[PDB]
Amino acid sequence: ELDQLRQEAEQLKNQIRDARKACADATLSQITNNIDPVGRIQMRTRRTLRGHLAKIYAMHWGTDSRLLVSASQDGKLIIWDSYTTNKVHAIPLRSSWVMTCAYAPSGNYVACGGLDNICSIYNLKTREGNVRVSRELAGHTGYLSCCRFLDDNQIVTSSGDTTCALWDIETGQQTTTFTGHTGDVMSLSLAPDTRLFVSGACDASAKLWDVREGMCRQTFTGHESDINAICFFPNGNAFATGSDDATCRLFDLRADQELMTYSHDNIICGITSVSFSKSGRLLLAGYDDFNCNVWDALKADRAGVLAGHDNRVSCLGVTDDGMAVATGSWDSFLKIWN
Amino acid sequence: KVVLLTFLSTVILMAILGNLLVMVAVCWDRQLRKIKTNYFIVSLAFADLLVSVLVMPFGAIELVQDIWIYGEVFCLVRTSLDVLLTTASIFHLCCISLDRYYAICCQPLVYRNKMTPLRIALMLGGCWVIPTFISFLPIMQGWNNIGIIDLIEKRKFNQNSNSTYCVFMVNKPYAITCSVVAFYIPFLLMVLAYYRIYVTAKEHAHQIQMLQRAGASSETKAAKTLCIIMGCFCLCWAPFFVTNIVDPFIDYTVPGQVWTAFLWLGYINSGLNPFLYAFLNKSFRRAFLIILCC
Amino acid sequence: TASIAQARKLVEQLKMEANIDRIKVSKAAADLMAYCEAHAKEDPLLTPVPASENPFR
Amino acid sequence: TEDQRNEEKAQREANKKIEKQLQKDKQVYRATHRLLLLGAGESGKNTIVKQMRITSGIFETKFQVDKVNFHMFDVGAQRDERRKWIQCFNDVTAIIFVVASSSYNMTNRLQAALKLFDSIWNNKWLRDTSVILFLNKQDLLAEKVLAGKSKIEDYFPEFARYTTPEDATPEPGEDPRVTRAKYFIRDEFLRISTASGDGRHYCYPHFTCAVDTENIRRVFNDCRDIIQRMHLRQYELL
Ligand SMILES: CC(C)CCC[C@@H](C)[C@H]1CC[C@H]2[C@@H]3CC=C4C[C@@H](O)CC[C@]4(C)[C@H]3CC[C@]12C
Ligand SMILES: CC(C)CCC[C@@H](C)[C@H]1CC[C@H]2[C@@H]3CC=C4C[C@@H](O)CC[C@]4(C)[C@H]3CC[C@]12C
Ligand SMILES: CC(C)CCC[C@@H](C)[C@H]1CC[C@H]2[C@@H]3CC=C4C[C@@H](O)CC[C@]4(C)[C@H]3CC[C@]12C
Ligand SMILES: CC(C)CCC[C@@H](C)[C@H]1CC[C@H]2[C@@H]3CC=C4C[C@@H](O)CC[C@]4(C)[C@H]3CC[C@]12C
Ligand SMILES: CCCCCCCCCCCCCCCC(=O)O
Ligand SMILES: CCCCCCCCCCCCCCCC(=O)O
Ligand SMILES: NCCc1c[nH]c2ccc(O)cc12
Secondary structure, three states: OHHHHHHHHHHHHHHHHHHHHHOOOOOHHHHHOOOOOOOOOOOOEEEEEOOOOOOEEEEEEOOOOOEEEEEEOOOEEEEEEOOOOOEEEEEEOOOOOEEEEEEOOOOOEEEEEEOOOOEEEEEOOOOOOOOEEEEEEOOOOOOEEEEEEOOOOEEEEEEOOOOEEEEEOOOOEEEEEEOOOOOOEEEEEEOOOOOEEEEEEOOOOEEEEEOOOOEEEEEEOOOOOOEEEEEEOOOOOEEEEEEOOOOEEEEEOOOOEEEEEEOOOOOOOOEEEEEEOOOOOEEEEEEOOOOEEEEEOOOOOEEEEEOOOOOOOOEEEEOOOOOOEEEEOOOOOEEEEO | OOHHHHHHHHHHHHHHHHHHHHHHHHHHOHHHHOOOHHHHHHHHHHHHHHHHHHOHHHHHHHHHHOOOOOHHHHHHHHHHHHHHHHHHHHHHHHHHHHHHHHHHHHOOOOHHHHOOHHHHHHHHHHHHHHHHHHHHHHHHHOOOOOOOHHHHHHHHEOOOOOOEOOOOOOOHHHHHHHHHHHHHHHHHHHHHHHHHHHHHHHHHHHHHHHHHHHHOOOOOHHHHHHHHHHHHHHHHHHHHHHHHHHOHHHOOOOOHHHHHHHHHHHHHHHHHOHHHHHOOOHHHHHHHHHHHHO | OOHHHHHHHHHHHHHHHHOOOOOOHHHHHHHHHHHHHHHHOOOOOOOOOOOOOOOOO | OHHHHHHHHHHHHHHHHHHHHHHHHHHHHHHEEEEEEEEOOOOOHHHHHHHHHOOOOOEEEEEEEOOEEEEEEEOOOOOOOOOOHHHHHOOOOEEEEEEEOOOOOOOOHHHHHHHHHHHHHOOOOOOOOEEEEEEEOHHHHHHHHHHOOOOHHHHOHHHOOOOOOOOOOOOOOOOHHHHHHHHHHHHHHHHHHHOOOOOOOOEOOEEOOOOOOOHHHHHHHHHHHHHHHHHHHHOOOO
16 A cells, blocks of 8 residues: 555656656757846945844835835834835834744735744734734744735745645635645745745745645755745746755746756855846845845856845845845845845 | 164054054944944054054154254143053053953943943043043143253253253152053053953853863963053053152153153054954954955 | 555645646747846846936935 | 925934834843743753743743843744754854753653754854753652662663762762762763864753752853853953
C-alpha cells in the first residue's frame, strides 16, 4: 500500500522533470543576447522617513502611489505620505513583534501580523477618524510571515505553520486553507487579476495557488535554500523569488519551471525582498549586506545598486504607478529611490 | 640647532591630522553620531585641534625665532588662548572618564536615557566655559602678575641683547588656584573613576576566567589600558603642573629649558589624545578601518 | 497512522500537477520580451522622467 | 488655491502630533530592556513566568527592578522550526534559557536542551546576544540524586570522569553528590558556551528553583553585568 504510493511519487517526479526538460530548448539568456542592454540604472536617496524606534521589517505601497505603510518591531505601524514625508498615522500594535503589514487596495483598511499568530485589520478612515482594530483573524498556529488584501473583505495570509489561508474579514473565519507547503511559508504575492497567488516557503519550493478553488496548481523547486521573497512579473505570467541561496530565480507559470537566474560572485548573503518595476524589465531585490541590487530582468546584469541603508534591508516595494521604489531596513529608516 | 623646527612642525602636523581624522570619522560614520558618548570625543578632538592651530604654532614661532614681535596685547591673548584650550582639553578628558565611569558602574541599565541632550550640553559647557574664568578673565585683567610685577621685569628681557619675548608668570595664589582647578581636581576625579572602572573590569574578568576554567575541555587588559591612558596624561601634564606649584615657592629659579620642555610635553597631549581615546575604542577603530578602505 | 493518507494526498496532487499544459520556453521568453518592450517606454525607473513631471522634486 | 495651504497645515499638525507621541514612546522604549525566554515545555519556564508576573505565539510579561523596566517575551506556542523567527530577537539584551537539570534520565531531554543551547549560541544572528542560563528544578534534581536510584553515571558517561571544581560554592548542608551533579550539568553547558572564546557574548548559568523568587534579581544582575561587559569591551577593558 504505502510502498507503491512512494514509488509512484518518484515516477511522478521523473515524468514531471522529463516534461520540464523537454519544454527547454533555449534559455532566456540566449534569446536576450541580441536585445539592447538596459545599461547602468542611476538612483539615489530621494526621501528619508524617520520615526520608527526599532528595526523595520515590512512595508507596503498604497494603490494611490502616495500613501505608504511600514511596520517596525517596536510595535509602531506608521502610515507615511511619501510626497510630503508627513506621518498620517502611527498605529500602536498590541504585539510589538510584527512581521508583516499590508495596505488595502481601496486604502480603507490596513493589516499586520507576526509572532502574535494573529492578523489585525485596522480601519483607517472610520467616521470617527480613529484607527482601531476592526477584527483579529486568529486561528493560525504559526507566526504570520506575509499578508495581502484581495479586497476590503478578503485577505490572504502566510504563517509559520506551513499553511496559507484566505480569510473573510467580516466573518473572521478562514474561507479557504492552503496546506501543500511542507516548510515555513515566508512570502506571498497576489497576481494582477487576484485569481492566483504564489507563496514561497523554507522548503525551497514555490507553489502557485488558486484563490477560489483552494489548491496549488504548480510547484517550483529551483531554489535550494529558504525562500524569503516572492513577486509576480507585472503581466502575471511569471514570478521571481528571493532566498538565502544568494540568488534570484524567475519562473513562468506556463513553462512550469525556472526561466533564468540572477547571481554574482561578489554576493554571498541572503535575499530579503524582491520586486518588479512597472514594465517588469528591472528586478529590484534587497540583500542582507545592507544594499539592494537592481537586476535586468531579461539580462540579469547589475544595472544599479542602492546602498543608503546601514543595516539589513528587510523589505522593498515599487509604487503601482512606477514613480518610485521604497526600501526599508533594520536601521529604522525608509529610503525612497527614483 | 634648527632641528627643533622639524620636530615641532611634525608634532603640530600629527596632532592636526589626528584630530581631523577623528572629527571626519565621527561625522561620516552616522552610526557613531547616534551615540551621545561620541560627542565628548568630538569636542575633545576639536579642542585639541584648536590647541594645535592657535597655541602650538605660536609657541614654535617663539622658540625658533626666540623673539616675540606681535606686542604685549597679543602676548596676553596667546597666553589666554593657551590656558583656555589646555584647560578645556583637560576637562574634556576628565568628563570622558566620568561619563565612562557613570555608564559602567553607576547607571549601566539606564545610561542611554540619562544621557539626555541637556546633560551633554551642560557637560560640554562646563568644559568650554569654566576655562574662560581662569584663562581670559585673570590674564586680561593682569591678576596673575600683581605682587610679582618686579620679578616679571627682570625675567621679561635677557638684556645682554636686544631680544624680547612673550612671558607668562604666575603668583602663588593664581598658580595654586589654577593648578588645582585645571589639573589636580580633574586628575583626582579621573583617578577615582578609572580605579572604580578597573575594579569592575577586574571582577568581570575574574568571573569570565572562572567560567572559562569550568568550561575548559582539557584580567590585566583593563589594567594595561588604564595604565597607558593615565601614564600618557601624567607624563604630559603632571610635570608642568608640579613645576607650576613649586615654581613660585623657589623664587622663580626654574630654568627656562625645563619650563619649555614641560610646556611642550603638555602640548603633546593634544597629539596623543586622538590616538588614545579613539584607538582604544572598538567603534572608532572600525570607523578608521572603514575610512582607510576608501 | 497518517502516513498513508499523506502519501495518497501527495500522489493526487502530483497527478494534478503533471496533467497541466506546458508551453515552449522560447515562447515564454518572447512573451516576456514583448511585455517589456511594450511598457519600457512607460517605466520611470528604466528611463528617468524629467524633473518637472517627477513629483519628488 | 488656499485648499493646498489648508491641507498642508493639517498634514503638518498631524505630523507634529504623531512626532510628539513617538518621542514620548522613545523614552520608555530605550529605558526598557527586552528579553527572550526559551526552554522546553516540560521545563519550569511557565512557573518562572508566573512568579515574575506575581494561545498567541508570544506571551509578553511586565516586571520592573530598581525602577528598570524589563519586557520578557515567551516564544512558546511556536513550532520547533526556530531558525526563522529567532532572527527577530537579535537585539534583545539577554536570552533567558531554562533547562530542567533534573531531566537527564527522562527521552534524553537534557541532551536535547544541550543541542538547542549549542544551536542558539552558535546562531548566526545571535553572535552578540548573551544567554541567561537558568538550570531550573534544582530541588527535583536534589531529590532524585539523594535517593540514590539515579544512574547519571552512564546517562552521561563523562560524569564518572568528572569531579567538583575547586571554585564551587555549594550552599550550607548541600550533599557532595548534589553539588557534583549540579556542577557537571553546569559545565556541560559552559563547554558549549566557552567554545566561542570571542567575548562578543557570555553565558550566565544559575542554580534556580521553579518557584525561586530571586530569579527576578538574577535577571536584573545578569542584564547589568551584560551591559557592563559590553561597555568594558567597547573601551578595550575586556
Ligand atoms: C557630527 C556632529 C553632529 C557631532 C556633534 C558633537 C557636538 C557636541 C560638537 C560638534 C561641534 C562642537 C562645537 C564646535 C564649536 C565650539 C566652539 C567653542 O568655542 C565652544 C564649543 C563649541 C560650540 C562646540 C560644542 C560641541 C559641538 C557642538
Ligand atoms: C572653577 C572656578 C572656581 C574658577 C574661577 C577661579 C577664580 C575665582 C580664581 C582664579 C584666579 C584667581 C585670582 C588669582 C590672583 C589673585 C591675587 C590675590 O592677591 C587675590 C585673589 C586673586 C585675585 C584670585 C581670585 C580668584 C581667582 C580669580
Ligand atoms: C601629579 C602626580 C603626583 C601624580 C602621580 C601619580 C600617582 C599620584 C598615582 C599613580 C598610581 C595611583 C594609585 C593607583 C591605584 C591606587 C589603588 C587605590 O588605593 C586607589 C588609589 C591608588 C593608591 C592610586 C593613588 C594615586 C597614584 C599613586
Ligand atoms: C609625574 C611627575 C611627579 C614626575 C616628576 C616630575 C619632575 C621631573 C619635576 C617635578 C619638580 C621639578 C623640579 C622643580 C625644581 C627644579 C629646580 C631647578 O633649579 C632645576 C629643575 C628642578 C629640579 C625641576 C626638575 C623636574 C622636576 C623634578
Ligand atoms: C561655549 C560652550 C558651548 C557648548 C555647546 C554644547 C552643545 C551641545 C550639543 C549636543 C548635540 C547636538 C547635536 C545636533 C547638532 C546640530 O544641530 O547640528
Ligand atoms: C590608573 C588609575 C586607576 C588604576 C588602573 C590601573 C591598575 C594597575 C594595577 C597594577 C597591578 C596589576 C597586577 C597584574 C597581575 C597579573 O598579570 O596577573
Ligand atoms: N600651557 C598650560 C596653560 C595652563 C592651563 N592651565 C593652567 C593653570 C595655571 C597656569 O599657570 C597655566 C595653565
